[PDB]
Amino acid sequence: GPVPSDRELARSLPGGFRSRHARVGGVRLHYVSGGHGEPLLLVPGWPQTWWAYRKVMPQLARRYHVIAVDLRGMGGSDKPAGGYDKKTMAADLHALVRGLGHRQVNVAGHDIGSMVAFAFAANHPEATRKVALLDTPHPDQSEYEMRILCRPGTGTTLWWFAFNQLQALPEQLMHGRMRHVIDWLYANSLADQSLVGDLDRDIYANAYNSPQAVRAGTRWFQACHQDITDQAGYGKLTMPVLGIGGNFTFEDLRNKLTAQATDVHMVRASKSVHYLPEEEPDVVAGALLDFFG
Amino acid sequence: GPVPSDRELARSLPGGFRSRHARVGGVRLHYVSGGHGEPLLLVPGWPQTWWAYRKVMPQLARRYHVIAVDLRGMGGSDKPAGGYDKKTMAADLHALVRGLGHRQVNVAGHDIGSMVAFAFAANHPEATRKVALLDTPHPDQSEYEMRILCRPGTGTTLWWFAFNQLQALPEQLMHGRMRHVIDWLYANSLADQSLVGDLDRDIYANAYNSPQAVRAGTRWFQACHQDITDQAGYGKLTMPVLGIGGNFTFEDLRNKLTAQATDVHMVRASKSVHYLPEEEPDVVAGALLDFFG
Numbered sequence A, B: 001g002p003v004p005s006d007r008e009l010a011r012s013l014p015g016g017f018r019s020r021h022a023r024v025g026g027v028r029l030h031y032v033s034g035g036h037g038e039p040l041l042l043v044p045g046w047p048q049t050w051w052a053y054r055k056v057m058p059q060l061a062r063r064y065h066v067i068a069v070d071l072r073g074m075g076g077s078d079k080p081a082g083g084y085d086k087k088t089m090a091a092d093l094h095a096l097v098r099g100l101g102h103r104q105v106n107v108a109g110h111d112i113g114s115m116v117a118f119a120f121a122a123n124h125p126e127a128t129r130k131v132a133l134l135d136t137p138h139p140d141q142s143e144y145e146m147r148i149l150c151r152p153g154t155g156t157t158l159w160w161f162a163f164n165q166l167q168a169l170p171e172q173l174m175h176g177r178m179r180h181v182i183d184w185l186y187a188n189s190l191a192d193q194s195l196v197g198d199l200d201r202d203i204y205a206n207a208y209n210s211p212q213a214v215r216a217g218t219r220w221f222q223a224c225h226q227d228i229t230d231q232a233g234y235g236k237l238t239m240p241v242l243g244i245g246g247n248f249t250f251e252d253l254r255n256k257l258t259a260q261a262t263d264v265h266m267v268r269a270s271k272s273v274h275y276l277p278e279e280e281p282d283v284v285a286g287a288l289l290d291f292f293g
């Protein structure tokens, strides 16, 4: 059944967060901001919303003016026909913080949002103070080397990477049924399932359960070829970079970031598989606070 | 019912085919047979049934006694807990044809059914007159080499190999919704969509639409590591082998069969992507008549 609105959710957090909207380049974005200090943009990924950062936002709000956004195609934000490449979505966020009167910001992103975080630093270095990448590197040529099958007992099948490439079938299969997808993902990541409760899962499922919302989600993934091409155009990132890697992705994240960025710092979230802000918020909040300063 | 019975479907075919059953080793298998002459076992794959051979069965029934089967886990056949490795499924079919009093049969299989067809020749050579593999080679180490992502225009996303590895999520997402799966597959293979009509698609969807049927289907794919292990133990087939390959699987199929078999013939289905019996039925019917003699 129904879940609380974004205003209800934002207000439920300590730190005085408010749910807001802003229109950038004709597209309306939802974000939740609060706290005081230098600006900190938080970007979530699939299939989640700004609410993915709930466990860390209050602590961060003590030091930063936190801006937690729904990406284009996500949650309360508009779901236009296109522009789901990370370069365009990063430009969205850039227009946003600039519209808010910020010349440069701290940026952290998770999952799809980490890609957007990287694209932001890549395309808008002057507006980028520091950037933190949570678990997920930007697409590059290595995306084409991902294997369909893992040998038994090794790693997790990244099935949704192939599946979300598809036209039509995803919304056809997943509409109304996104809670099952969320349950599968959490079942193959959380050390304790109670790390993300029923309500939290239902908030994501409700945001993604319509065919248009599923579809918008897939566009982030279908954009991968374009993202890969754009990535070839990026010079190395030279501002401070933070990579926070889960227990099984850490060394691959370190490799990619050290190759694509010149001032890289790494942190290992040893008790996490992927949903870092939810699996080890203590590590993410602490890492970001020490890193952004 | 939702669609015509297998009994109705069998009778609708010229050549006087009849739908039957038989129990082998506690597992009840459905098949449709007809015609006169030397026995010819026909094996379909995912997500199809014996009905996939409808366009060629009448032509073949004039020269061979055709036996078109639903595999274990498929269509009208039982769907037990296990035994979905291709070796076990081949033993099923061996027991079946021996129970019918045939010492040797010709064998042809497509898709998953082609793997079983190969396993049949491999494990029961004395019961194999000749064997034809339609498009799909038996699993080997190369399966761990399949790529999650294709460069644009470089081929189709083979997403279902990854997806069908999963526990629970496949039934949850696909039950009641297999028609959409079938449509996607046909949308990415048929040169003309009317090659497979609306009712035919619903016949397949109906066979697979319950959670148990989706699940049984995934077992064929989850057995892949075990199939790969079994393949390593096989000697070269020395009976006549025919490979019929689609325009894009041909050369891989030719490589594998020639390495695994000493008497190999190849045929190119130049206007087909994968569903050879439905896409180029005359080429298929014609090739089998020439090969089985």
Ligand SMILES: C[C@]12O[C@H]1[C@H](O)c1c(cc(O)c3c1C(=O)c1cccc(O)c1-3)C2=O
Binding pocket: A045, A046, A047, A111, A112, A135, A136, A156, A160, A161, A185, A186, A188, A189, A249, A273, A274
């Ligand atoms: C872009 C994205 O594909 C999205 C997904 O959010 C993602 C990604 C990586 C994972 O390793 C990963 C996941 C994910 O949902 C997940 C669940 C369980 C285990 C696991 O390891 C993962 C990604 O970077």
Ligand SMILES: C[C@]12O[C@H]1[C@H](O)c1c(cc(O)c3c1C(=O)c1cccc(O)c1-3)C2=O
Binding pocket: B045, B046, B047, B111, B112, B136, B156, B160, B161, B185, B186, B188, B189, B249, B273, B274
């Ligand atoms: C075992 C199986 O995975 C099953 C599927 O039936 C299959 C297989 C190979 C394909 O290349 C292939 C398909 C398939 O449905 C399909 C549709 C569109 C393009 C295309 O190329 C394919 C297989 O071998």
Ligand code: NA
Binding pocket: A006, A007, A008, A010, A011, A017, A018, A019
């Ligand atoms: Na509010």
